[PDB]
Design a protein around this ligand. Structure first.
Ligand SMILES: CCCCCCCCCCCCCCCCCC(=O)OC[C@H](COP(=O)([O-])OCC(O)COP(=O)([O-])OC[C@@H](COC(=O)CCCCCCCCCCCCCCCCC)OC(=O)CCCCCCCCCCCCCCCCC)OC(=O)CCCCCCCCCCCCCCCCC
Ligand SMILES: CC(C)=CCC/C(C)=C/CC/C(C)=C/CC/C(C)=C/CC/C(C)=C/CC/C(C)=C/CC/C(C)=C/CC/C(C)=C/CC/C(C)=C/CC1=C(C)C(=O)c2ccccc2C1=O
Ligand SMILES: CCCCCCCCCCCCCCCC(=O)O[C@H](COC(=O)CCCCCCC[C@@H](C)CCCCCCCCC)COP(=O)(O)O[C@H]1[C@H](O)[C@H](O)[C@H](O)[C@@H](O)[C@@H]1O
Ligand code: HEC
Ligand code: HEC
Ligand SMILES: CCCCCCCCCCCCCCCC(=O)OC[C@H](C)OC(=O)CCCCCCCC[C@@H](C)CCCCCCCC
Ligand SMILES: *C(=O)CCCCCCCCCCCCCCC
Lengths: 223, 54, 158
């Protein structure tokens, strides 16, 4: 749309031309060129907030978004027009699809997640560490569109999962599994984070062992 | 120590040729039947197509 | 001190299939080939399209885009001298939006190549983009822009 393109350009010119140079070409050693990144990349990155980025470090951290959905769409449309590339999914009305991205199959989504996603994130989408200051973040904050677009465009040190590699049905199943694992209550008590051995051992040593030692000190006599 | 064989910068290489898999020998001799027919000649089988062009 | 002069985030290429060639005043971004292949190779004699974006770096311009031809006889239909502190978008990468009902100079400088040589996805094929400023080999890839999986035949156990 003409006005959408104009709004995207105006936001771009006063947000990122210092590190994604005007004309969408990347500033050498400050930011990559956005030609070909597409609307999906812009949506995911700006909505998660990573892109109003105020440091060059191991990894761009997530943060509150600096733009509302309309401005996100404007920036995405501008980048898509300039470069041309993957587009964020949308529902019948036109808004970014959230529920439509919940795949029907969850066992298949979990299998795909374990083969591809858990590699670094977790068994259930908690975070993971990477080589030098990087890390795979927890997926519990991401909404279905954000998960789908994260797969569609490998944000940073994350493999780029094309539609051919993971058909949109497979990505929808993975999104369903991610949301289900994130929103599912821990059966058996308080899941201490999602990592078994380390949080479980700390909770033993702090809750069970201090209780046992304190009870022993109560029963016995100091000497 | 380090592994004996590493770091061959020279010999940039060549693009692999298109793979032409050989048919499975007597070991995996199993193969799909090409079509059963009487074949009262040198052999044609139960499969034969043709394109009538202009 | 992952934030030092050598930091992971800054030194990252775009997560796009097209390669980047900064050599020369005009910088080539997302340069790829739209060559939908139905088999191992894209047979010679078929026309495949050459996508890229030529961004001008200097305002003092290098808008010539003389030949940019290599093995394949790349031809630039609707050629124009666009780059003046801006972008020359030769084609329409999958997902591209026209951005307006009308258009300028009909096609926006579409580059098409008659292969004269087999090509396949996953290989890198050298293209010499030559502006009046200078010439640069780019080693363009083959990109399947937005086409979904082509149905592979079901497998019969044996
Ligand atoms: C990390 C976090 C924790 C890791 C390790 C924590 C260790 C804490 C142990 C505290 C125990 C204690 O003070 O008990 C006395 C204290 C009083 O009881 P008491 O009746 O006076 O004791 C009888 C005698 O007094 C006899 O007891 P005492 O009071 O004469 O002994 C005091 C102390 C004397 O020994 C020392 O001075 C050791 C000092 C070690 C410091 C090292 C830290 C350096 C860090 C710098 C590097 C960082 C970089 O001995 C120790 O506690 C040795 C601990 C050495 C482990 C150091 C780990 C590192 O106990 C309590 O009331 C609660 C203690 C609960 C702990 C239960 C586990 C006990 C198992 C081993 C204890 C040793 C046997 C003593 C019985
Ligand atoms: C190989 C090795 C140990 C490398 C170094 C890594 C390491 C342990 C670094 C230290 C971690 C810390 C303390 C980070 C904060 C930044 C920092 C270093 C500050 C300065 C430290 C300093 C001198 C502070 C002043 C006084 C002081 C010593 C304060 C220490 C503060 C802390 C964190 C005290 C408690 C120790 C603690 C929790 C350490 C982390 C270790 C583990 C295994 C935690 C386990 C655990 C985890 C990881 C969960 O996610 C979780 C989720 C839900 C429920 C439960 C848990 C749980 O129990
Ligand atoms: C003494 C015996 C008592 C033991 C404690 C028992 C507590 C029972 C709690 C009630 C029943 C179980 C509730 C289970 C529901 C439940 O699981 O609880 C979460 C909470 O979780 C948190 O944040 C933690 C909140 C802080 C309170 C609990 C802290 C207790 C620790 C300290 C006990 C261990 C001791 C360790 C000592 C440490 C010091 C060592 C020196 C809440 O949901 P949420 O917050 O959203 O979880 C996120 C998903 O959503 C999202 O996708 C996912 O991605 C995640 O982000 C996930 O967190
Ligand atoms: C280590 C390889 C890697 C694998 C494989 C991978 N991820 Fe990621 N993922 C990352 C990293 C690193 C980030 C952080 C990107 C950033 O912050 O720019 C990330 C970001 C995300 C986010 C954004 C979360 C947020 O709140 O910002 C989600 C959701 C996600 N990944 C889910 C997935 C899904 C779905 C798959 C599909 C298999 C997957 N991951 C596979 C490493 C990986
Ligand atoms: C240096 C500060 C910085 C600013 C500010 C910034 N970017 Fe970026 N951008 C980067 C870096 C670094 C990367 C690649 C590493 C990363 O994303 O963590 C990147 C990558 C991207 C990507 C993903 C590229 C890919 O291949 O997946 C998009 C989309 C993007 N930028 C758009 C934007 C938009 C839109 C804005 C303004 C709303 C913006 N950026 C502001 C530095 C910045
Ligand atoms: C022998 C043991 C005793 C020490 C001997 C003398 C020890 C003398 C230590 C000289 C250290 C010289 C460093 C030179 C830096 C370098 O060239 O590499 C750059 C690198 C890339 O930059 C970094 O990555 C981080 C660099 C900053 C280090 C923050 C450390 C903060 C410590 C806190 C976490 C508090 C810990 C509590 C510590 C508590 C102790 C308080 C004193
Ligand atoms: C990236 O991870 C950190 C970048 C910081 C580089 C500059 C460090 C300045 C020196 C700090 C001194 C620390 C205490 C020294 C104890 C002897």
């Amino acid at each position: 749309q003409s006005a959408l393109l104009r709004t995207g350009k105006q936001l771009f010119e006063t947000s990122c031309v210092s590190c994604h140079g005007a004309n969408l070409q990347g500033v050498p050693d400050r930011g990559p060129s956005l030609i070909g990144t597409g609307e999906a990349a812009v949506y995911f990155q700006v909505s998660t907030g990573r892109m109003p980025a105020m440091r060059g470090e191991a990894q761009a951290p997530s943060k509150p978004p600096h733009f509302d959905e309309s401005q996100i769409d404007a920036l995405g449309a501008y980048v898509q027009a300039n470069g041309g590339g993957p587009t964020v999914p949308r529902d019948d009305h036109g808004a970014v699809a959230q529920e439509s991205l919940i795949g029907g199959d969850v066992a298949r989504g979990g299998d795909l997640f374990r083969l591809n996603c858990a590699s670094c994130h977790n068994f259930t989408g908690k975070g993971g560490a990477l080589s030098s200051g990087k890390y795979a973040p927890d997926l519990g904050d991401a909404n279905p569109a954000q998960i789908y677009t994260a797969m569609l465009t490998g944000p940073q040190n994350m493999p780029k999962f094309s539609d051919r590699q993971l058909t949109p049905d497979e990505k929808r199943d993975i999104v369903a599994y991610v949301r289900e694992s994130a929103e599912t209550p821990s059966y058996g008590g308080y899941g201490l984070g999602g990592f078994g051995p380390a949080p479980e051992g700390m909770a033993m040593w702090i809750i069970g062992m201090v209780a046992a030692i304190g009870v022993a000190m109560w029963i016995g006599s100091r000497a | 120590c380090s592994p004996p064989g590493e770091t061959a910068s020279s010999e940039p290489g060549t693009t692999p040729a298109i793979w032409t898999g050989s048919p499975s020998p007597a070991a995996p001799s199993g193969e799909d039947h090409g079509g059963g027919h009487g074949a009262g000649a040198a052999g044609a089988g139960e499969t034969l197509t043709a394109e009538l062009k202009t | 001190c992952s934030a030092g002069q050598i930091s992971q985030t800054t030194t990252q290429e775009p997560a796009v299939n097209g390669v980047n060639a900064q050599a020369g005043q005009v910088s080539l971004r997302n340069v790829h080939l739209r060559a939908p292949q139905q088999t191992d190779y894209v047979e010679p004699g078929t026309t495949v399209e050459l996508l890229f974006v030529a961004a001008n770096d200097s305002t003092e311009s290098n808008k010539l885009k003389s030949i940019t031809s290599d093995v394949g006889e790349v031809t630039l239909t609707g050629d124009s001298t666009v780059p003046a502190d801006g972008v020359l978008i030769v084609g329409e990468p999958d997902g591209q939006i026209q951005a307006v009902e009308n258009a300028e100079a009909a096609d926006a400088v579409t580059a098409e190549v008659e292969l004269t040589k087999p090509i396949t996805n996953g290989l890198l094929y050298d293209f010499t983009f030559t502006f009046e400023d200078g010439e640069t080999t780019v080693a363009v890839p083959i990109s399947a822009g937005e086409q979904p999986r082509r149905p592979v035949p079901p497998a019969g156990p044996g």
